[model samples]
Target: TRVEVQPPAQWVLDLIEASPIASVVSDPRLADNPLIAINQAFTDLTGYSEEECVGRNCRFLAGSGTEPWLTDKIRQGVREHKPVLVEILNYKKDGTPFRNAVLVAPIYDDDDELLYFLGSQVEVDDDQPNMGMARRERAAEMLKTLSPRQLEVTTLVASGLRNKEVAARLGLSEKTVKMHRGLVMEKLNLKTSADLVRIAVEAGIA
Candidate 1:
């Protein structure tokens, strides 16, 4: 029996076709039903071709240098049907180890059944020592510009506290707490609470 299958959303397909990073969408049913609708950038990054990768499992990209813990984490996420994000070691077609940031998310149909898995991979060469040091320096600069009250609020925010919860913890009225939040955003040039949390992560406030 054949079931009707809808094509992916146009914007999503466009993104996969245009993304500089390697990306793939695989049907949950098949071990490797769909593969390698990737852009030239992806081929250039991984040294793999559409023809070379078709009908192959993504695990083929891993080598002896790939960490066991990373594979375990991915398996765990799939087992739990949750989004997985990690930075780990992976191999190119030539079997050279490189740092890669990979994110995998499960897509579900209207019936809430797993329909597909979307994966994106980015090379992280700049995440090495000197680049990490530069990120730390930038974070310090951002922190130095925050007021003590703003820093306290950001720390709480980073810890996943709601606005009211932060106010209660700081012994301040919620309205007053919101005012401080507004000032925090203005001083930091942040536009939203999410942005504040991102800054907190960068600043090591969490």
Candidate 2:
């Protein structure tokens, strides 16, 4: 069944399509924060088409084996406007179970206004015991792409430090710190501070 959903801008849609990861976007302003867009990778991973997935909360994938506490963590992230990562057992549309390493992050515009929630999922196997640690290892590898100064600023900012404090901590001018912050975000293709926060958790920097 098709449902009407107020989705994000076209640019954001394009970004989702470009992402190699399984991704979905949900409009939080809507009641229940129903998904408005999903990439092909997400559909392939979950066996749910865009028509079947949109207009529904992701909780639709939760089943008897899905842990309430882990799901609760995701709910808290949405309510608190933060990022959350969890490994949960989620069911496919056909009732098949899979280990899902899910990361939900808030996307904000330049004005710092929250626009949407971006969820990226990765399927894991029983061999991967700690999905969280696995993600951190990947993040650590990505961190190598940044310069030392940029990495320092990103680590602090993602750890919840303000620019001024990051400057004070690093013994740099706040303006310089802000410049590094912007560069870090740009280099990482992160649209908002919340994205950095999620990456921090993944990188084990927070």
Candidate 3:
């Protein structure tokens, strides 16, 4: 669903140039949209110039060695309009293979319509072995603190439902929905539905 509608910041451009990570933004309307813009870091990381990449789909960066399952997972995420994080093998402009940790988020407009996708790629070296472990651990801990009702509410929240929507889904009154939400937040020390959703995602509850 749509949430925020605004242009990307210039700092994002600067970050792309200064960081070692590669990043891309894709149009939501096209299945294989050309990259609208890319920073110098992306060019350096992939060995492809901005000029060469601006009109090309990201699929160009994949090769025979890339994991088919990973690609399928990414496709499924897009198809389902969800955020996903995965580690997969990717190829550079020179056909050099690199292990990359990828995060993709579906950006939505104010009307809840898909607007664009933001993707970030970081090269994973040996030192980052426990990258997601802390998040997973925290997720597990938070999950244990929730009741079955809270868990169900959290799951619906994670799937992008508002309190009213969750109430309808659970056949509960709106006031009862608010009570569950309040209890969930009190137990988890969360201030907003966004926080609940984040924890649910980390725990793989959705």
Candidate 4:
């Protein structure tokens, strides 16, 4: 006999997916944290397709000049079962170097079983011809649409705590804290933390 499953309503699912975060999910139980699912914004920012990327580890984005120390931090986070937030030097499909701020956190079940890792990324550079000014405007527009969660995330990020501490303070998952912060920064059209905080303060979110 099959059991009936009543999940969230479709409207709520729409809300879940409509956030501006660039979301990715990785199955840690799989080899090397292969990509399991990615939202459209992930591909928009990364220049890869779901079909081309779904089965590979994120190291696929790392290039010859990539920083080993940053990768080391990621492994360390996984080893400690902690959330990680870092600025990553990565690349797009066309060999364009993109500066990415990323967040990673583990999801666990009610019984304390490890589930998966969720990732969120935001590109910080405005070097591309087709993306600079328009992208900046896009961020400005994101301000008007900031979700309550996004406000909470950025305001806490402005408090100068690490993502782990922010998550703890806000009772949010590491993944969610990262995603909200990333989206907040993107919306505010800033990159560096000091400036990010300055604008956040000017906007009263800090």
Candidate 5:
């Protein structure tokens, strides 16, 4: 259902160049969903090389310090063709740990092709000591079990977008948007749309 996207050629281009957001796009048809493309931001985020990362499955990004179970959610999403989000410990090339929040969503073509899985990520905290990861060994221990994508939905809805508007802005089905909003409320121990708005305001881009 998420069209307006096309199949690929060489992709270490524009989106990565113009934006600082780290992302990894993979071929969904491939066995392990290998990284088909990533941006400078991605390399910068993980201290990886474009050459070093492109063909690799991201499980290599994990280490003993990482939460191994969170990968199950991503694997389940791939098996069932749904998007998934989770936050976990990741290391830089130098092997320093930081918290990375990732959201990987699938794209199915008009012919029902499983074209790609686009995963976006960022360091969850910076300059807060632990910096993000350095500060959060405990924070990681207290990891927000909420799906990262739903936070975008809540912030946008709190900013006053209707369901249809939020859906369009996010390129998601309205039903999908609605479902995630409900999930956000349920996971955060909140009760209503209004309760979420407060959470969104207080949360501020986490």
Candidate 6:
């Protein structure tokens, strides 16, 4: 039988424990959106055991280099129930800094009730073995200068969304969306949105 991956259930905990990726399931109904379950991959990724992390927020991983804007973007995405992917400089338990590419999205039940937030993290510098070579190379190139926010905007634009619509989805102003679009073009040596779309598609981020 199939079972939902919502925590507070033994089956869900077992499922999370068996996941291959660095996975964390956090309950939004809790006071601080605390992590309820994490897999062994997560322990290996952060050098933190499940016993130490299960009841706390993920912010413990943040370090001095962790930017305010990056966390703000994630918080905004969580509040709006949108999926967000960003690379951040995070620290392990021993204070070793690593570039972490994190993807987080809200989980909702059949009745449309927001239940949990599922987050996955991978080291951007040394990507997971399962990550594709082409996409990994592109990500490395973009992380050199292009911000993840701009990357997000570019992907939306690549998907045939207008600037205004992208702004609405990202909860940013149209001008902000336009600025990101222009920056992406300037960095990639593109002249028009059409060129950006082409590059995005070729990059497999569309």
- Candidate 4's residue-wise lDDT over 1-206, tens digit each? 11122332332233214446566656676667776666678778888887766767877878877788987887886676655656678898888888776656554322334455556676766555344345445544555577888767766765445677788998988888768876776766554343344334334343
lDDT of 4: 0.61
Candidate with more favorable, higher TM-score: 4 or 6: 6
Score every model by TM-score: 0.53, 0.75, 0.55, 0.55, 0.55, 0.57
Q: Residue pairs in steric clash, candidate 2?
A: none
lDDT of 3 by residue, 109-177 (tens): 333344555566667655666656676689789788788998898777566555567788999986897
Better of 2 and 4 by lDDT: 2
Off by over 4 Å in 6: 1-7, 109-114, 126-133, 136-206
lDDT, candidate 2, 69-186, per-residue tens: 9999989987876677888999998998988888887664433345677788888877766766767887888788999888878877665455666888999997898788778878
What is the alpha-carbon RMSD of candidate 5 to the true structure?
Answer: 10.7
Clashing pairs in 3: 1-112, 2-109, 2-112
lDDT of 6 by residue, 11-53 (tens): 3454356555577778777767888877788999999997788
The lDDT for every candidate, in the order shown, is 0.62, 0.77, 0.66, 0.61, 0.62, 0.68
- Candidate 1 colliding pairs: none
lDDT of 1 by residue, 45-128 (tens): 789886666555667678767888887886775566555556677888887777766655544332333445556676778446
- The predictions' CA RMSDs to the true structure, in order, are 8.7, 4.4, 7.5, 9.8, 10.7, 11.9
Write the residue-wise lDDT of candidate 5 on 71-113 in tens digits. 8887887777555657788888889888777666554322333
Clashes of 6: 0
- TM-score winner: 2
User: Which residue pairs show collisions in model 5?
Assistant: 130-134, 130-135
Q: How accurate is candidate 1 locally (lDDT)?
A: 0.62
Instruction: TM-score for candidate 6, please give it.
Output: 0.57
Give the residue spans of candidate 4 off by over 4 A: 1-16, 109-112, 126-206
Best by lDDT: 2
